[PDB]
Amino acid sequence: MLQPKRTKFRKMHKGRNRGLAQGTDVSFGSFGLKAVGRGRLTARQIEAARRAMTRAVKRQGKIWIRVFPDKPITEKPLAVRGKGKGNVEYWVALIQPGKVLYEMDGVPEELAREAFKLAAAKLPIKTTFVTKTVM
Amino acid sequence: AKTIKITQTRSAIGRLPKHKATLLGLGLRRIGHTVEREDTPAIRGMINAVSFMVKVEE
Amino acid sequence: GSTRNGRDSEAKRLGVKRFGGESVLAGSIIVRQRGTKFHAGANVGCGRDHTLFAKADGKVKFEVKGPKNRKFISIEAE
Amino acid sequence: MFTINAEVRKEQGKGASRRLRAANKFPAIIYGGKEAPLAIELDHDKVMNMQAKAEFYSEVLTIVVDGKEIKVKAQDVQRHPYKPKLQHIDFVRA
Amino acid sequence: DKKSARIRRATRARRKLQELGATRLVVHRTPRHIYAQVIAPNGSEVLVAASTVEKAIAEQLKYTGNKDAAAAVGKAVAERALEKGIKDVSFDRSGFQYHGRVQALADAAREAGLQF
RNA sequence: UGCCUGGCGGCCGUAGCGCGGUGGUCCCACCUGACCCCAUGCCGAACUCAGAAGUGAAACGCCGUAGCGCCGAUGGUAGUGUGGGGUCUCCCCAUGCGAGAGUAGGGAACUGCCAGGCA
RNA sequence: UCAACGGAUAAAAGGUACUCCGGGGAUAACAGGCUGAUACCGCCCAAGAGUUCAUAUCGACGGCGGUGUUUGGCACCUCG
RNA sequence: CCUAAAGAGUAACGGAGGAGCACGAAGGUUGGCUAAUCCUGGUCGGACAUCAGGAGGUUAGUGCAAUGGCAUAAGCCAGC
RNA sequence: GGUUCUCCCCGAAAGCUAUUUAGGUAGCGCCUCGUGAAUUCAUCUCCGGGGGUAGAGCACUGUUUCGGCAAAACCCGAUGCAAACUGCGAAUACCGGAGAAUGUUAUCACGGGAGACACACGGCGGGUGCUAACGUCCGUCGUGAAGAGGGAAACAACCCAGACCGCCAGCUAAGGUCCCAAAGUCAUGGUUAAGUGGGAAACGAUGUGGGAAGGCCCAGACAGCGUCGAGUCGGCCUGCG
Ligand SMILES: [K+]
Ligand SMILES: [K+]
Ligand SMILES: [K+]
Ligand SMILES: [K+]
Ligand SMILES: [K+]
Ligand SMILES: [K+]
Ligand SMILES: [K+]
Ligand SMILES: [K+]
Ligand SMILES: [K+]
Ligand SMILES: [K+]
Ligand SMILES: [K+]
Ligand SMILES: [Mg+2]
Ligand SMILES: [Mg+2]
Ligand SMILES: [Mg+2]
Ligand SMILES: [Mg+2]
Ligand SMILES: [Mg+2]
Ligand SMILES: [Mg+2]
Ligand SMILES: [Mg+2]
Ligand SMILES: [Mg+2]
Ligand SMILES: [Mg+2]
Ligand SMILES: [Mg+2]
Ligand SMILES: [Mg+2]
Ligand SMILES: [Mg+2]
Ligand SMILES: [Mg+2]
Ligand SMILES: [Mg+2]
Ligand SMILES: [Mg+2]
Ligand SMILES: [Mg+2]
Ligand SMILES: [Mg+2]
Ligand SMILES: [Mg+2]
Ligand SMILES: [Mg+2]
Ligand SMILES: [Mg+2]
Ligand SMILES: [Mg+2]
Ligand SMILES: [Mg+2]
Ligand SMILES: [Mg+2]
Ligand SMILES: [Mg+2]
Ligand SMILES: [Mg+2]
Ligand SMILES: [Mg+2]
Ligand SMILES: [Mg+2]
Ligand SMILES: [Mg+2]
Ligand SMILES: [Mg+2]
Ligand SMILES: [Mg+2]
Ligand SMILES: [Mg+2]
Ligand SMILES: [Mg+2]
Ligand SMILES: [Mg+2]
């Protein structure tokens, strides 16, 4: 599960998630899965979608994960009432509309579409299949 | 030389302090109240600030 | 559980006290600062805590001089 | 061979630009050479189909604006972040 | 580099004199020559000057870049300054040690009647 | 009057590095000595003094060259004050303000005082 | 010495189910409320299991909801 | 220091760290000086000691946290 | 806990700081009465300012993905992320100056009298919490508090709007106009067949409207069985279901 090796700080303000994404182009591969919705992707979701995607292409071609879960999310234990910020439980990437989540190369488009369809079913955010443009 | 007629069209209740001060600066006192003012950039700036609650007769 | 945080210091009310064009008497503090974010120009002194103060009556003037683009404050004798 | 029709823009800035795109057009700019920049409107669907072909970015294009023809190359394109639409194109005078 | 290292040495004092708003007596020294200038407070206006490149002074001297030449230039610049009527100046050693030729120039300027 | 050189200011990278060429009569630099004035936590390297055989190599200055650094529109985009609206974790509309990044393009600086040499 | 750091006196621990008074729904325990993390009940994707065969029966990794039986959160009602 | 909404101020049993000193020089002044790191060569000497040159340009230093500063140095050395 | 006649004018606060203090109290802030001194104060326009927020960016501090070169890091590139990153950087806000118009003198000082120091919800910017709570803690504006009237079925805090008194006059605001119940069974053009409207998601599906391309097509396509004779196929965007 993706996670920063180290961080300056353990805990982060909730913050907000406004705006449109940077990294909206297929930069590395030929085909991309792009976020159309807004939300958070946990490390577990990123991994689950990766596994489905990889299996679907039978470990042929190459897959880039463009998103990294670098935001720590805390939670308070059950039956606790205050008394300080909770403990870090998991990590997320903030997603905005347009963010390319995954790229893939060295497979037919037909297979890429299938793999990304399987991946998209693991994600809480609405996605769309995209292709590399010349400009 | 030229004057303009300004009329208050909406209430001042619940408006920002600045807006209330602007109506006071124009001399508008109540809904429907019309005043005649010299047409200057200073007056136009005031009208602009509260344009959503005044109408101007040129 | 408990917290190990919960501490802070009093706010020190730093910053610019007299902005550009303001007329000041000699002695008047122009800026309170930690270190010289602004430097003393003409008719301005720098105190031991890097407070910039007027050494003459006049108008405050901010200006950028030198290759580093350092911010100077000076008093235009008026 | 690629020919484009273009009006000259009356209004500019955020409000005007967003109104264009709501009316299925989009803004664009022609610059380069010694002539001053020229701000134009384009029909979206027409140009969207053209630029799908990869020759649009390589070839020299013609922009017919107020009768006059102008030879240009597509310099830069701003796409919509997720929808298949164009927000803006830069054309450099060829 | 030597000149840049000297400009560094001269900055503190020069910035200070600018702040005080003093009429400077700026000295420049080379292996062969020594110069002198009385520059006005604004800093973009030379009032008087003297040097061993000037033929009026150089003709009287054995060598131009020695203590005795500096003594001559010191006398020269001071007399011309008192002619215009300046008197009160601040010496600016311009990054050179106040020693030898520079000291010699300065001493001669004092004896002549400049007040520093 | 013009050119070149030095000094002191005004002007802060469109003024900086690089690359190519170029200057020594004066000026400047290195350079020649050092017992001394003075100097090295060792050293005449530097500082300093006494000099003028050599040299424009280095340094410094001047001219060319986009190769960089750097500067940089127009348009669009982001954000946003006020008013209004929605499907309200976020947006849209009217109006005003409007970046950052990037693109075209540029860039190989400009200017006063004093002094000296030369024609 | 005043660190409980604007320092009650120089000098300052406990028990009360034997209890008592003034008060408070300004504040807990019951029940109601708001919430729904948790709980419970569904669904989406389908790796795989199922002799073969994803979907007879199951269903990993992940996703989306419903309910208001749970454990809770909050402290809005009630301490004449 | 952040939360703090580009003047000041601004809460929570919010997120992070420090203090309860030191120094007759580590103060004053005058004169001078300029770092880290890496590369190349060199007795013992090694990844790293000291020497030389180059690149680099403050990525060092600042009595002790962090922030703002610092080359005219506020950093380093000496005289008085 | 209770505190007894009337009318008129103005009219808070639920904050900061300190407190064996926290439901108490004190100074200050906010109210009132009085006295005094300024074209004092406010709104707008123009002018002079500082900024490091939003946004952005990635040289720096950290973090992140993939490549090209090498004793598999740097160097050479591409790509993201940041409350405690900044080689950038708004809108607003704030300070100062000038000018007009307008304003209940609204500013400042001193003095007499206070009350108040449990706030609530709504909007916007946030911390906390589960971007849970009619939750909690700040900033800022509004309303309630201390505010009636109309609207939102009913509904302190939302929308419209500020009640000196009287009228069996009139015009409007939000919101409305088939009947309950005042006013269009109004006009023109569309959409929906679900009582959707009048409760909700991933996701599913020849529902249906609009728009732009593309493939095939009287050299006979698609469906049914070489035969039969005109439009058809399968995706995209989009409205309503
Ligand atoms: K105490
Ligand atoms: K007992
Ligand atoms: K009770
Ligand atoms: K000392
Ligand atoms: K000393
Ligand atoms: K009080
Ligand atoms: K009073
Ligand atoms: K970075
Ligand atoms: K609020
Ligand atoms: K009110
Ligand atoms: K219905
Ligand atoms: Mg924010
Ligand atoms: Mg602080
Ligand atoms: Mg707008
Ligand atoms: Mg622009
Ligand atoms: Mg720009
Ligand atoms: Mg205390
Ligand atoms: Mg009792
Ligand atoms: Mg209660
Ligand atoms: Mg209960
Ligand atoms: Mg309960
Ligand atoms: Mg409460
Ligand atoms: Mg009850
Ligand atoms: Mg009840
Ligand atoms: Mg009872
Ligand atoms: Mg502040
Ligand atoms: Mg602010
Ligand atoms: Mg406050
Ligand atoms: Mg009243
Ligand atoms: Mg940001
Ligand atoms: Mg209290
Ligand atoms: Mg309170
Ligand atoms: Mg409050
Ligand atoms: Mg909020
Ligand atoms: Mg509450
Ligand atoms: Mg809430
Ligand atoms: Mg009350
Ligand atoms: Mg009411
Ligand atoms: Mg009502
Ligand atoms: Mg009613
Ligand atoms: Mg009517
Ligand atoms: Mg009726
Ligand atoms: Mg009809
Ligand atoms: Mg219904």
Curated annotation (Swiss-Prot), chain B:
Keywords for the protein's UniProt record, in alphabetical order: Ribonucleoprotein, Ribosomal protein
GO molecular function terms noted in the UniProt entry: structural constituent of ribosome
One cellular component (GO) term of this entry: cytosolic large ribosomal subunit
Alphabetical GO biological process terms: cytoplasmic translation; ribosomal large subunit assembly
Bridged cysteine pairs (disulfide): none
SUPFAM superfamilies documented for this protein: Ribosomal protein L30p/L7e
InterPro entries, A to Z: Ribo_uL30_ferredoxin-like_sf, Ribosomal_uL30_bac-type, Ribosomal_uL30_CS, Ribosomal_uL30_ferredoxin-like
Organism superkingdom: Bacteria
UniProt xrefs under NCBIfam families: rpmD_bact
Additional comment: This protein is located near the guanosine triphosphatase center of the 50S subunit.
Similarity comment text for this entry: Belongs to the universal ribosomal protein uL30 family.
Subunit-structure text: Part of the 50S ribosomal subunit.
Protein name stated in the entry: Large ribosomal subunit protein uL30
Gene it is expressed from: rpmD
Swiss-Prot record, chain D:
Pfam families membership: Ribosomal_L25p (PF01386)
GO cellular component annotations of the record: cytoplasm; cytosol; cytosolic large ribosomal subunit
GO MF, any single term: 5S rRNA binding
Domain of life from the UniProt record: Bacteria
TM region(s), chain numbering: none
Gene Ontology biological process: cytoplasmic translation; negative regulation of translation; response to radiation; ribosomal large subunit assembly; translation
UniProt keyword terms in alphabetical order: Ribonucleoprotein, Ribosomal protein, RNA-binding, rRNA-binding
Cited InterPro entries: Rbsml_bL25/Gln-tRNA_synth_N (IPR020056), Ribosomal_bL25/Gln-tRNA_synth (IPR011035), Ribosomal_bL25_short (IPR020055), Ribosomal_L25_dom (IPR029751), Ribosomal_uL5_bac-type (IPR020930)
Alphabetized PANTHER family for the sequence: RIBOSOMAL PROTEIN L25/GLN-TRNA SYNTHETASE, ANTI-CODON-BINDING DOMAIN-CONTAINING PROTEIN, RIBOSOMAL PROTEIN L25_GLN-TRNA SYNTHETASE, ANTI-CODON-BINDING DOMAIN-CONTAINING PROTEIN
Biological role: This is one of the proteins that binds to the 5S RNA in the ribosome where it forms part of the central protuberance. Binds to the 5S rRNA independently of L5 and L18. Not required for binding of the 5S rRNA/L5/L18 subcomplex to 23S rRNA.
Protein family according to the UniProt entry: Belongs to the bacterial ribosomal protein bL25 family.
Subunit structure: Part of the 50S ribosomal subunit; part of the 5S rRNA/L5/L18/L25 subcomplex. Contacts the 5S rRNA.
HAMAP family: Ribosomal_bL25
Listed name of the protein: Large ribosomal subunit protein bL25
Species, as recorded: Escherichia coli (strain K12)
Gene responsible for this protein: rplY
